[PDB]
JSON list of C-alpha atoms and ligand atoms in Angstrom, two decimals:
[
{"chain": "A", "resi": 101, "resn": "UNK", "atom": "CA", "xyz": [109.71, 138.64, 177.00]},
{"chain": "A", "resi": 102, "resn": "UNK", "atom": "CA", "xyz": [108.47, 140.18, 173.75]},
{"chain": "A", "resi": 103, "resn": "UNK", "atom": "CA", "xyz": [105.46, 142.49, 173.41]},
{"chain": "A", "resi": 104, "resn": "UNK", "atom": "CA", "xyz": [104.02, 142.97, 169.91]},
{"chain": "A", "resi": 105, "resn": "UNK", "atom": "CA", "xyz": [101.28, 145.07, 168.37]},
{"chain": "A", "resi": 106, "resn": "UNK", "atom": "CA", "xyz": [98.45, 143.53, 166.28]},
{"chain": "A", "resi": 107, "resn": "UNK", "atom": "CA", "xyz": [100.14, 144.19, 162.92]},
{"chain": "A", "resi": 108, "resn": "UNK", "atom": "CA", "xyz": [103.49, 142.76, 164.03]},
{"chain": "A", "resi": 109, "resn": "UNK", "atom": "CA", "xyz": [105.23, 145.93, 162.85]},
{"chain": "A", "resi": 110, "resn": "UNK", "atom": "CA", "xyz": [106.27, 147.04, 166.36]},
{"chain": "A", "resi": 111, "resn": "UNK", "atom": "CA", "xyz": [107.85, 144.90, 169.07]},
{"chain": "A", "resi": 112, "resn": "UNK", "atom": "CA", "xyz": [109.49, 145.49, 172.44]},
{"chain": "A", "resi": 113, "resn": "UNK", "atom": "CA", "xyz": [112.05, 143.02, 173.83]},
{"chain": "A", "resi": 114, "resn": "UNK", "atom": "CA", "xyz": [113.57, 143.01, 177.31]},
{"chain": "A", "resi": 115, "resn": "UNK", "atom": "CA", "xyz": [117.37, 142.94, 177.54]},
{"chain": "A", "resi": 116, "resn": "UNK", "atom": "CA", "xyz": [117.06, 142.94, 181.31]},
{"chain": "A", "resi": 117, "resn": "UNK", "atom": "CA", "xyz": [115.32, 144.75, 184.17]},
{"chain": "A", "resi": 118, "resn": "UNK", "atom": "CA", "xyz": [114.74, 148.33, 183.00]},
{"chain": "A", "resi": 119, "resn": "UNK", "atom": "CA", "xyz": [116.27, 148.00, 179.54]},
{"chain": "A", "resi": 120, "resn": "UNK", "atom": "CA", "xyz": [114.19, 146.95, 176.54]},
{"chain": "A", "resi": 121, "resn": "UNK", "atom": "CA", "xyz": [114.82, 147.10, 172.82]},
{"chain": "A", "resi": 122, "resn": "UNK", "atom": "CA", "xyz": [112.08, 148.50, 170.57]},
{"chain": "A", "resi": 123, "resn": "UNK", "atom": "CA", "xyz": [111.89, 147.43, 166.93]},
{"chain": "A", "resi": 124, "resn": "UNK", "atom": "CA", "xyz": [109.66, 148.69, 164.14]},
{"chain": "A", "resi": 125, "resn": "UNK", "atom": "CA", "xyz": [109.23, 147.66, 160.50]},
{"chain": "A", "resi": 126, "resn": "UNK", "atom": "CA", "xyz": [109.04, 150.21, 157.70]},
{"chain": "A", "resi": 127, "resn": "UNK", "atom": "CA", "xyz": [107.70, 149.50, 154.21]},
{"chain": "A", "resi": 128, "resn": "UNK", "atom": "CA", "xyz": [109.87, 149.57, 151.09]},
{"chain": "A", "resi": 129, "resn": "UNK", "atom": "CA", "xyz": [109.88, 145.42, 155.55]},
{"chain": "A", "resi": 130, "resn": "UNK", "atom": "CA", "xyz": [112.99, 146.96, 157.13]},
{"chain": "A", "resi": 131, "resn": "UNK", "atom": "CA", "xyz": [113.58, 146.67, 160.93]},
{"chain": "A", "resi": 132, "resn": "UNK", "atom": "CA", "xyz": [115.12, 149.45, 163.03]},
{"chain": "A", "resi": 133, "resn": "UNK", "atom": "CA", "xyz": [116.14, 149.25, 166.72]},
{"chain": "A", "resi": 134, "resn": "UNK", "atom": "CA", "xyz": [116.17, 151.69, 169.60]},
{"chain": "A", "resi": 135, "resn": "UNK", "atom": "CA", "xyz": [115.91, 151.38, 173.38]},
{"chain": "A", "resi": 136, "resn": "UNK", "atom": "CA", "xyz": [113.13, 151.82, 175.92]},
{"chain": "A", "resi": 137, "resn": "UNK", "atom": "CA", "xyz": [114.37, 152.60, 179.44]},
{"chain": "A", "resi": 138, "resn": "UNK", "atom": "CA", "xyz": [111.97, 152.08, 182.32]},
{"chain": "A", "resi": 139, "resn": "UNK", "atom": "CA", "xyz": [113.06, 154.44, 185.06]},
{"chain": "A", "resi": 140, "resn": "UNK", "atom": "CA", "xyz": [111.66, 155.67, 188.37]},
{"chain": "A", "resi": 141, "resn": "UNK", "atom": "CA", "xyz": [110.87, 158.91, 186.54]},
{"chain": "A", "resi": 142, "resn": "UNK", "atom": "CA", "xyz": [109.24, 158.18, 183.19]},
{"chain": "A", "resi": 143, "resn": "UNK", "atom": "CA", "xyz": [110.29, 156.22, 180.12]},
{"chain": "A", "resi": 144, "resn": "UNK", "atom": "CA", "xyz": [113.37, 157.20, 178.14]},
{"chain": "A", "resi": 145, "resn": "UNK", "atom": "CA", "xyz": [113.77, 156.15, 174.53]},
{"chain": "A", "resi": 146, "resn": "UNK", "atom": "CA", "xyz": [116.84, 155.97, 172.32]},
{"chain": "A", "resi": 147, "resn": "UNK", "atom": "CA", "xyz": [115.63, 156.97, 168.84]},
{"chain": "A", "resi": 148, "resn": "UNK", "atom": "CA", "xyz": [112.05, 157.08, 167.58]},
{"chain": "A", "resi": 149, "resn": "UNK", "atom": "CA", "xyz": [110.74, 155.29, 164.48]},
{"chain": "A", "resi": 150, "resn": "UNK", "atom": "CA", "xyz": [110.46, 155.66, 160.70]},
{"chain": "A", "resi": 151, "resn": "UNK", "atom": "CA", "xyz": [107.50, 158.02, 160.80]},
{"chain": "A", "resi": 152, "resn": "UNK", "atom": "CA", "xyz": [104.94, 159.66, 163.10]},
{"chain": "A", "resi": 153, "resn": "UNK", "atom": "CA", "xyz": [102.38, 156.84, 162.77]},
{"chain": "A", "resi": 154, "resn": "UNK", "atom": "CA", "xyz": [104.79, 154.15, 164.01]},
{"chain": "A", "resi": 155, "resn": "UNK", "atom": "CA", "xyz": [106.34, 156.51, 166.57]},
{"chain": "A", "resi": 156, "resn": "UNK", "atom": "CA", "xyz": [103.00, 157.49, 168.08]},
{"chain": "A", "resi": 157, "resn": "UNK", "atom": "CA", "xyz": [101.99, 153.84, 168.23]},
{"chain": "A", "resi": 158, "resn": "UNK", "atom": "CA", "xyz": [105.34, 152.81, 169.75]},
{"chain": "A", "resi": 159, "resn": "UNK", "atom": "CA", "xyz": [104.90, 155.48, 172.41]},
{"chain": "A", "resi": 160, "resn": "UNK", "atom": "CA", "xyz": [101.26, 154.86, 173.38]},
{"chain": "A", "resi": 161, "resn": "UNK", "atom": "CA", "xyz": [102.27, 151.23, 173.64]},
{"chain": "A", "resi": 162, "resn": "UNK", "atom": "CA", "xyz": [105.16, 151.55, 176.13]},
{"chain": "A", "resi": 163, "resn": "UNK", "atom": "CA", "xyz": [103.23, 154.17, 178.09]},
{"chain": "A", "resi": 164, "resn": "UNK", "atom": "CA", "xyz": [100.36, 151.71, 178.35]},
{"chain": "A", "resi": 165, "resn": "UNK", "atom": "CA", "xyz": [102.55, 148.84, 179.53]},
{"chain": "A", "resi": 166, "resn": "UNK", "atom": "CA", "xyz": [104.62, 150.77, 182.04]},
{"chain": "A", "resi": 167, "resn": "UNK", "atom": "CA", "xyz": [101.82, 153.21, 182.93]},
{"chain": "A", "resi": 168, "resn": "UNK", "atom": "CA", "xyz": [104.24, 156.13, 182.66]},
{"chain": "A", "resi": 169, "resn": "UNK", "atom": "CA", "xyz": [104.96, 158.81, 180.10]},
{"chain": "A", "resi": 170, "resn": "UNK", "atom": "CA", "xyz": [107.93, 158.96, 177.74]},
{"chain": "A", "resi": 171, "resn": "UNK", "atom": "CA", "xyz": [109.82, 162.00, 178.98]},
{"chain": "A", "resi": 172, "resn": "UNK", "atom": "CA", "xyz": [112.95, 162.00, 176.80]},
{"chain": "A", "resi": 173, "resn": "UNK", "atom": "CA", "xyz": [114.27, 160.48, 173.61]},
{"chain": "A", "resi": 174, "resn": "UNK", "atom": "CA", "xyz": [117.85, 160.44, 172.36]},
{"chain": "A", "resi": 175, "resn": "UNK", "atom": "CA", "xyz": [118.15, 160.88, 168.59]},
{"chain": "A", "resi": 176, "resn": "UNK", "atom": "CA", "xyz": [121.32, 159.11, 167.38]},
{"chain": "A", "resi": 177, "resn": "UNK", "atom": "CA", "xyz": [121.29, 160.83, 163.95]},
{"chain": "A", "resi": 178, "resn": "UNK", "atom": "CA", "xyz": [119.19, 162.66, 161.33]},
{"chain": "A", "resi": 179, "resn": "UNK", "atom": "CA", "xyz": [117.70, 159.79, 159.31]},
{"chain": "A", "resi": 180, "resn": "UNK", "atom": "CA", "xyz": [114.04, 158.77, 159.17]},
{"chain": "A", "resi": 181, "resn": "UNK", "atom": "CA", "xyz": [114.55, 155.62, 161.27]},
{"chain": "A", "resi": 182, "resn": "UNK", "atom": "CA", "xyz": [115.83, 157.68, 164.22]},
{"chain": "A", "resi": 183, "resn": "UNK", "atom": "CA", "xyz": [114.22, 161.13, 163.87]},
{"chain": "A", "resi": 184, "resn": "UNK", "atom": "CA", "xyz": [111.15, 160.05, 161.87]},
{"chain": "A", "resi": 185, "resn": "UNK", "atom": "CA", "xyz": [108.68, 160.90, 164.60]},
{"chain": "A", "resi": 186, "resn": "UNK", "atom": "CA", "xyz": [110.22, 164.13, 165.87]},
{"chain": "A", "resi": 187, "resn": "UNK", "atom": "CA", "xyz": [106.90, 165.89, 165.28]},
{"chain": "A", "resi": 188, "resn": "UNK", "atom": "CA", "xyz": [105.12, 163.35, 167.49]},
{"chain": "A", "resi": 189, "resn": "UNK", "atom": "CA", "xyz": [107.63, 163.81, 170.30]},
{"chain": "A", "resi": 190, "resn": "UNK", "atom": "CA", "xyz": [107.35, 167.59, 170.26]},
{"chain": "A", "resi": 191, "resn": "UNK", "atom": "CA", "xyz": [103.55, 167.69, 170.54]},
{"chain": "A", "resi": 192, "resn": "UNK", "atom": "CA", "xyz": [103.58, 165.19, 173.43]},
{"chain": "A", "resi": 193, "resn": "UNK", "atom": "CA", "xyz": [105.96, 167.28, 175.48]},
{"chain": "A", "resi": 194, "resn": "UNK", "atom": "CA", "xyz": [108.74, 164.74, 174.91]},
{"chain": "A", "resi": 195, "resn": "UNK", "atom": "CA", "xyz": [112.27, 166.15, 174.84]},
{"chain": "A", "resi": 196, "resn": "UNK", "atom": "CA", "xyz": [114.23, 165.21, 171.70]},
{"chain": "A", "resi": 197, "resn": "UNK", "atom": "CA", "xyz": [117.91, 165.33, 172.72]},
{"chain": "A", "resi": 198, "resn": "UNK", "atom": "CA", "xyz": [120.53, 165.56, 169.99]},
{"chain": "A", "resi": 199, "resn": "UNK", "atom": "CA", "xyz": [123.87, 167.15, 169.16]},
{"chain": "A", "resi": 200, "resn": "UNK", "atom": "CA", "xyz": [123.81, 170.57, 167.51]},
{"chain": "A", "resi": 201, "resn": "UNK", "atom": "CA", "xyz": [124.95, 168.96, 164.25]},
{"chain": "A", "resi": 202, "resn": "UNK", "atom": "CA", "xyz": [122.14, 166.41, 164.28]},
{"chain": "A", "resi": 203, "resn": "UNK", "atom": "CA", "xyz": [119.68, 169.25, 164.89]},
{"chain": "A", "resi": 204, "resn": "UNK", "atom": "CA", "xyz": [120.83, 171.21, 161.85]},
{"chain": "A", "resi": 205, "resn": "UNK", "atom": "CA", "xyz": [120.99, 168.21, 159.51]},
{"chain": "A", "resi": 206, "resn": "UNK", "atom": "CA", "xyz": [117.44, 167.39, 160.64]},
{"chain": "A", "resi": 207, "resn": "UNK", "atom": "CA", "xyz": [116.20, 170.78, 159.49]},
{"chain": "A", "resi": 208, "resn": "UNK", "atom": "CA", "xyz": [118.17, 170.29, 156.27]},
{"chain": "A", "resi": 209, "resn": "UNK", "atom": "CA", "xyz": [116.32, 166.99, 155.73]},
{"chain": "A", "resi": 210, "resn": "UNK", "atom": "CA", "xyz": [112.94, 168.59, 156.39]},
{"chain": "A", "resi": 211, "resn": "UNK", "atom": "CA", "xyz": [112.35, 167.25, 159.92]},
{"chain": "A", "resi": 212, "resn": "UNK", "atom": "CA", "xyz": [111.31, 169.41, 162.88]},
{"chain": "A", "resi": 213, "resn": "UNK", "atom": "CA", "xyz": [114.35, 170.40, 164.90]},
{"chain": "A", "resi": 214, "resn": "UNK", "atom": "CA", "xyz": [115.49, 168.50, 168.03]},
{"chain": "A", "resi": 215, "resn": "UNK", "atom": "CA", "xyz": [117.18, 170.15, 171.05]},
{"chain": "A", "resi": 216, "resn": "UNK", "atom": "CA", "xyz": [120.81, 170.11, 169.83]},
{"chain": "A", "resi": 217, "resn": "UNK", "atom": "CA", "xyz": [121.91, 169.96, 173.49]},
{"chain": "A", "resi": 218, "resn": "UNK", "atom": "CA", "xyz": [124.19, 166.88, 173.52]},
{"chain": "A", "resi": 219, "resn": "UNK", "atom": "CA", "xyz": [127.90, 167.69, 173.50]},
{"chain": "A", "resi": 220, "resn": "UNK", "atom": "CA", "xyz": [130.64, 165.24, 172.44]},
{"chain": "A", "resi": 221, "resn": "UNK", "atom": "CA", "xyz": [130.35, 163.55, 175.86]},
{"chain": "A", "resi": 222, "resn": "UNK", "atom": "CA", "xyz": [127.10, 164.03, 177.76]},
{"chain": "A", "resi": 223, "resn": "UNK", "atom": "CA", "xyz": [125.97, 162.17, 180.88]},
{"chain": "A", "resi": 224, "resn": "UNK", "atom": "CA", "xyz": [122.24, 162.06, 181.60]},
{"chain": "A", "resi": 225, "resn": "UNK", "atom": "CA", "xyz": [120.57, 160.49, 184.63]},
{"chain": "A", "resi": 226, "resn": "UNK", "atom": "CA", "xyz": [116.86, 159.70, 184.61]},
{"chain": "A", "resi": 227, "resn": "UNK", "atom": "CA", "xyz": [115.91, 158.52, 188.07]},
{"chain": "A", "resi": 228, "resn": "UNK", "atom": "CA", "xyz": [118.44, 155.83, 188.86]},
{"chain": "A", "resi": 229, "resn": "UNK", "atom": "CA", "xyz": [119.10, 155.11, 185.17]},
{"chain": "A", "resi": 230, "resn": "UNK", "atom": "CA", "xyz": [122.45, 156.44, 183.87]},
{"chain": "A", "resi": 231, "resn": "UNK", "atom": "CA", "xyz": [122.98, 157.21, 180.18]},
{"chain": "A", "resi": 232, "resn": "UNK", "atom": "CA", "xyz": [126.05, 158.45, 178.33]},
{"chain": "A", "resi": 233, "resn": "UNK", "atom": "CA", "xyz": [125.98, 159.82, 174.81]},
{"chain": "A", "resi": 234, "resn": "UNK", "atom": "CA", "xyz": [129.16, 159.85, 172.79]},
{"chain": "A", "resi": 235, "resn": "UNK", "atom": "CA", "xyz": [130.09, 161.34, 169.43]},
{"chain": "A", "resi": 236, "resn": "UNK", "atom": "CA", "xyz": [132.85, 159.06, 168.09]},
{"chain": "A", "resi": 237, "resn": "UNK", "atom": "CA", "xyz": [133.23, 160.98, 164.84]},
{"chain": "A", "resi": 238, "resn": "UNK", "atom": "CA", "xyz": [131.89, 160.62, 161.31]},
{"chain": "A", "resi": 239, "resn": "UNK", "atom": "CA", "xyz": [130.77, 157.17, 160.12]},
{"chain": "A", "resi": 240, "resn": "UNK", "atom": "CA", "xyz": [127.34, 155.99, 158.95]},
{"chain": "A", "resi": 241, "resn": "UNK", "atom": "CA", "xyz": [126.59, 159.73, 158.83]},
{"chain": "A", "resi": 242, "resn": "UNK", "atom": "CA", "xyz": [128.41, 162.92, 159.81]},
{"chain": "A", "resi": 243, "resn": "UNK", "atom": "CA", "xyz": [126.49, 163.32, 163.08]},
{"chain": "A", "resi": 244, "resn": "UNK", "atom": "CA", "xyz": [126.03, 159.74, 164.36]},
{"chain": "A", "resi": 245, "resn": "UNK", "atom": "CA", "xyz": [126.46, 159.15, 168.12]},
{"chain": "A", "resi": 246, "resn": "UNK", "atom": "CA", "xyz": [126.44, 156.04, 170.28]},
{"chain": "A", "resi": 247, "resn": "UNK", "atom": "CA", "xyz": [124.71, 155.51, 173.60]},
{"chain": "A", "resi": 248, "resn": "UNK", "atom": "CA", "xyz": [126.25, 153.80, 176.62]},
{"chain": "A", "resi": 249, "resn": "UNK", "atom": "CA", "xyz": [124.55, 152.45, 179.75]},
{"chain": "A", "resi": 250, "resn": "UNK", "atom": "CA", "xyz": [127.39, 152.25, 182.34]},
{"chain": "A", "resi": 251, "resn": "UNK", "atom": "CA", "xyz": [125.34, 150.20, 184.83]},
{"chain": "A", "resi": 252, "resn": "UNK", "atom": "CA", "xyz": [124.82, 147.37, 182.32]},
{"chain": "A", "resi": 253, "resn": "UNK", "atom": "CA", "xyz": [127.76, 148.09, 180.01]},
{"chain": "A", "resi": 254, "resn": "UNK", "atom": "CA", "xyz": [125.26, 148.12, 177.17]},
{"chain": "A", "resi": 255, "resn": "UNK", "atom": "CA", "xyz": [126.26, 150.01, 174.03]},
{"chain": "A", "resi": 256, "resn": "UNK", "atom": "CA", "xyz": [123.73, 151.23, 171.47]},
{"chain": "A", "resi": 257, "resn": "UNK", "atom": "CA", "xyz": [125.83, 151.50, 168.34]},
{"chain": "A", "resi": 258, "resn": "UNK", "atom": "CA", "xyz": [122.98, 152.55, 166.10]},
{"chain": "A", "resi": 259, "resn": "UNK", "atom": "CA", "xyz": [123.55, 152.48, 162.35]},
{"chain": "A", "resi": 260, "resn": "UNK", "atom": "CA", "xyz": [127.31, 152.84, 163.02]},
{"chain": "A", "resi": 261, "resn": "UNK", "atom": "CA", "xyz": [127.42, 149.11, 163.88]},
{"chain": "A", "resi": 262, "resn": "UNK", "atom": "CA", "xyz": [126.23, 146.33, 161.54]},
{"chain": "A", "resi": 263, "resn": "UNK", "atom": "CA", "xyz": [124.48, 143.20, 162.78]},
{"chain": "A", "resi": 264, "resn": "UNK", "atom": "CA", "xyz": [126.16, 139.81, 162.46]},
{"chain": "A", "resi": 265, "resn": "UNK", "atom": "CA", "xyz": [124.49, 138.72, 159.23]},
{"chain": "A", "resi": 266, "resn": "UNK", "atom": "CA", "xyz": [124.61, 142.15, 157.59]},
{"chain": "A", "resi": 267, "resn": "UNK", "atom": "CA", "xyz": [127.20, 142.10, 154.82]},
{"chain": "A", "resi": 268, "resn": "UNK", "atom": "CA", "xyz": [126.06, 145.47, 153.51]},
{"chain": "A", "resi": 269, "resn": "UNK", "atom": "CA", "xyz": [126.96, 148.78, 155.15]},
{"chain": "A", "resi": 270, "resn": "UNK", "atom": "CA", "xyz": [123.67, 150.30, 154.00]},
{"chain": "A", "resi": 271, "resn": "UNK", "atom": "CA", "xyz": [123.23, 153.84, 152.73]},
{"chain": "A", "resi": 272, "resn": "UNK", "atom": "CA", "xyz": [126.67, 155.40, 152.31]},
{"chain": "A", "resi": 273, "resn": "UNK", "atom": "CA", "xyz": [125.58, 158.42, 150.26]},
{"chain": "A", "resi": 274, "resn": "UNK", "atom": "CA", "xyz": [125.59, 160.41, 153.50]},
{"chain": "A", "resi": 275, "resn": "UNK", "atom": "CA", "xyz": [128.38, 158.32, 155.05]},
{"chain": "A", "resi": 276, "resn": "UNK", "atom": "CA", "xyz": [132.10, 158.93, 155.53]},
{"chain": "A", "resi": 277, "resn": "UNK", "atom": "CA", "xyz": [133.43, 155.43, 154.81]},
{"chain": "A", "resi": 278, "resn": "UNK", "atom": "CA", "xyz": [137.10, 156.24, 155.32]},
{"chain": "A", "resi": 279, "resn": "UNK", "atom": "CA", "xyz": [136.60, 157.97, 158.70]},
{"chain": "A", "resi": 280, "resn": "UNK", "atom": "CA", "xyz": [134.05, 155.36, 159.80]},
{"chain": "A", "resi": 281, "resn": "UNK", "atom": "CA", "xyz": [136.84, 152.95, 160.88]},
{"chain": "A", "resi": 282, "resn": "UNK", "atom": "CA", "xyz": [138.55, 155.52, 163.11]},
{"chain": "A", "resi": 283, "resn": "UNK", "atom": "CA", "xyz": [135.20, 156.39, 164.69]},
{"chain": "A", "resi": 284, "resn": "UNK", "atom": "CA", "xyz": [134.58, 152.78, 165.62]},
{"chain": "A", "resi": 285, "resn": "UNK", "atom": "CA", "xyz": [138.13, 152.69, 167.03]},
{"chain": "A", "resi": 286, "resn": "UNK", "atom": "CA", "xyz": [137.29, 155.66, 169.29]},
{"chain": "A", "resi": 287, "resn": "UNK", "atom": "CA", "xyz": [134.29, 153.75, 170.66]},
{"chain": "A", "resi": 288, "resn": "UNK", "atom": "CA", "xyz": [136.47, 150.68, 171.24]},
{"chain": "A", "resi": 289, "resn": "UNK", "atom": "CA", "xyz": [139.19, 152.73, 172.97]},
{"chain": "A", "resi": 290, "resn": "UNK", "atom": "CA", "xyz": [136.61, 154.52, 175.11]},
{"chain": "A", "resi": 291, "resn": "UNK", "atom": "CA", "xyz": [134.65, 151.49, 176.32]},
{"chain": "A", "resi": 292, "resn": "UNK", "atom": "CA", "xyz": [136.96, 148.64, 177.32]},
{"chain": "A", "resi": 293, "resn": "UNK", "atom": "CA", "xyz": [134.47, 146.31, 179.00]},
{"chain": "A", "resi": 294, "resn": "UNK", "atom": "CA", "xyz": [131.45, 146.06, 176.71]},
{"chain": "A", "resi": 295, "resn": "UNK", "atom": "CA", "xyz": [128.83, 143.40, 177.36]},
{"chain": "A", "resi": 296, "resn": "UNK", "atom": "CA", "xyz": [126.01, 143.82, 174.87]},
{"chain": "A", "resi": 297, "resn": "UNK", "atom": "CA", "xyz": [125.93, 146.08, 171.83]},
{"chain": "A", "resi": 298, "resn": "UNK", "atom": "CA", "xyz": [122.69, 146.88, 170.00]},
{"chain": "A", "resi": 299, "resn": "UNK", "atom": "CA", "xyz": [123.05, 147.44, 166.22]},
{"chain": "A", "resi": 300, "resn": "UNK", "atom": "CA", "xyz": [120.86, 149.91, 164.31]},
{"chain": "A", "resi": 301, "resn": "UNK", "atom": "CA", "xyz": [119.25, 146.96, 162.56]},
{"chain": "A", "resi": 302, "resn": "UNK", "atom": "CA", "xyz": [119.48, 143.35, 163.70]},
{"chain": "A", "resi": 303, "resn": "UNK", "atom": "CA", "xyz": [119.95, 141.20, 166.80]},
{"chain": "A", "resi": 304, "resn": "UNK", "atom": "CA", "xyz": [121.70, 142.39, 169.92]},
{"chain": "A", "resi": 305, "resn": "UNK", "atom": "CA", "xyz": [125.26, 141.12, 169.97]},
{"chain": "A", "resi": 306, "resn": "UNK", "atom": "CA", "xyz": [128.57, 142.01, 171.59]},
{"chain": "A", "resi": 307, "resn": "UNK", "atom": "CA", "xyz": [131.80, 143.84, 170.78]},
{"chain": "A", "resi": 308, "resn": "UNK", "atom": "CA", "xyz": [132.24, 141.29, 168.00]},
{"chain": "A", "resi": 309, "resn": "UNK", "atom": "CA", "xyz": [129.75, 143.44, 166.08]},
{"chain": "A", "resi": 310, "resn": "UNK", "atom": "CA", "xyz": [132.17, 146.36, 166.13]},
{"chain": "A", "resi": 311, "resn": "UNK", "atom": "CA", "xyz": [134.93, 144.08, 164.85]},
{"chain": "A", "resi": 312, "resn": "UNK", "atom": "CA", "xyz": [132.55, 142.72, 162.22]},
{"chain": "A", "resi": 313, "resn": "UNK", "atom": "CA", "xyz": [131.78, 146.24, 161.04]},
{"chain": "A", "resi": 314, "resn": "UNK", "atom": "CA", "xyz": [135.46, 147.16, 160.89]},
{"chain": "A", "resi": 315, "resn": "UNK", "atom": "CA", "xyz": [135.82, 144.09, 158.70]},
{"chain": "A", "resi": 316, "resn": "UNK", "atom": "CA", "xyz": [133.13, 145.25, 156.28]},
{"chain": "A", "resi": 317, "resn": "UNK", "atom": "CA", "xyz": [134.84, 148.66, 156.09]},
{"chain": "A", "resi": 318, "resn": "UNK", "atom": "CA", "xyz": [138.24, 147.25, 155.05]},
{"chain": "B", "resi": 448, "resn": "LIG", "atom": "ZN1", "xyz": [120.94, 156.20, 159.03]},
{"chain": "B", "resi": 449, "resn": "LIG", "atom": "ZN1", "xyz": [120.63, 152.28, 159.40]}
]
């Protein structure tokens, strides 16, 4: 099941029951993924979108479909594709969770500041939905974190994991290429039984995406 907006720039795909993947296209047409979690107590998103226009539209779209409000959003790192609509979240009473590092880099990049509440390992529970945020170390960026849904064994790798047809690591000006490999290793050592892994850009895959990325980093 895929729900799209009129322009075709924003789509929502269902991984299963309460887990959907949201994708938006930014102009430069670059796609970026995040998650939408339908819980008994509001909608929880993993990352926003490129800017406030797309983010506001993404939000008013999932709130319309699920007839609930987006209560929280987990920002995986301080780049436009993840923290682009931080302003939109803050004026709608939506909590923008992030590590302290992500929060400071956000301000350094001219974005409004998120909560900076996530520690290296943080477990959040929204209704019956369980979420785990993990900072594996420096990789795509210095602050990048991954998200893990223990009930589905779904891992949101974010820009730290490349899709299967991506042969380019992407922007490495802010990246730590040498440490990237160790950081993926920490994710692999931490989560032994992964089912699906969502890349920052691209189709949902499996742990083979982490191996693929380690290959690109060699
Ligand atoms: Zn990025
Ligand atoms: Zn990226």
